[PDB]
């Protein structure tokens, strides 16, 4: 009654038709490294990190794009899948500044956790590194666009859910700046969520700025007051 039997590393799993490769892997317990995909946001194949090789295929498909059909043996720990993750990680960090001490995000950073586990130990890189002029977005959100990995997640956030339409890609190749072209002071509702949407230290809270690192502060669960929804 609308269920497809497919294999993740040779293990049987039942899924609804229309679901993505990453959605099927979440059912068994697997988690493919990602940068664009979000549970609440839409689907885009920008970064091409969530590469997972399915057998009897010449090219490796992304976990974002492909919907699961009948009869697929998704191999997560094959020789080509490991080389795909190690490859793109080196491309992502070739044009990204050495800012981990001056970065507002510490242990929470998505680039840090993934590059240690999935990426290579050393980089081939010798010469390059692009530098991006920072744009003052608002007094609530500090913006250093040098660290941005042009993942296109905040642009989708402002367009589809926030519904403000200010952020956008301008330029081609290396010279691509994420943000408002007209230098407009972006202030609206849900603007304090775009700091949490961004996986890297490109967008961060200006009132918080620098106080503690993610690992240093002890987390405690509470319901927020002074709000109707709670």
């Amino acid at each position: 009654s609308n269920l497809i039997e497919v294999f993740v590393d040779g293990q049987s799993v039942m899924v609804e038709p229309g679901t993505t490769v990453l959605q099927a892997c979440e059912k068994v317990g697997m988690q493919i490294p990602r940068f664009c995909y979000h549970e609440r946001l839409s689907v885009a194949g920008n970064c091409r990190m969530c590469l997972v090789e399915i057998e009897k295929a010449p090219k490796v498909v992304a976990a974002c794009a492909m919907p699961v059909m009948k009869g697929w043996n998704i191999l997560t720990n094959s020789e080509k899948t490991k080389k795909a993750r190690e490859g793109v990680m080196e491309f992502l960090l070739a044009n990204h500044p050495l800012d981990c001490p001056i970065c507002d995000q510490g242990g929470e950073c998505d680039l840090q956790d993934q590059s240690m586990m999935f990426g290579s130990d050393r980089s081939r890189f010798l010469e390059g590194k692009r530098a991006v002029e920072d744009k003052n977005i608002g007094p609530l959100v500090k913006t250093i666009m040098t660290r941005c990995i042009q993942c296109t997640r905040c642009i989708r956030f402002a367009s589809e859910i926030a519904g403000v339409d200010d952020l956008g890609t301008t330029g081609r190749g290396n010279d691509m700046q994420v943000g408002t072209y007209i230098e407009k002071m972006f202030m609206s509702e849900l603007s304090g969520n775009i700091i949490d949407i961004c996986p890297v230290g490109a967008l961060t809270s200006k009132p918080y700025a620098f106080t503690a690192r993610p690992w240093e502060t002890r987390k405690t669960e509470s319901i927020d007051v002074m709000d109707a929804v709670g």
Binding site: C100, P101, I102, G106, A209, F210, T211, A212, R213, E216
Partner: protein
């Protein structure tokens, strides 16, 4: 290369070299070094509190 006395260095043209990463806090096996970070109102991210107690620290 000898370890015995704690002292924080600075650049040849003034300016405090320390950045307040708290990196040295996490590695510290005695958990001796305490650090509170704040912006210095002029863009740069540096230190406010920086206590390395010699009651603790196994050098």
């Amino acid at each position: 290369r000898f370890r015995g006395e704690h002292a924080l260095r600075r650049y040849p043209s003034g300016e405090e070299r320390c950045i307040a990463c708290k990196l040295c806090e996490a590695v510290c096996p005695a958990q001796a070094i305490t650090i509170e970070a704040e912006p210095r109102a002029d863009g740069s991210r540096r230190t406010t509190r920086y206590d390395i107690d010699m009651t603790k620290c196994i050098y």
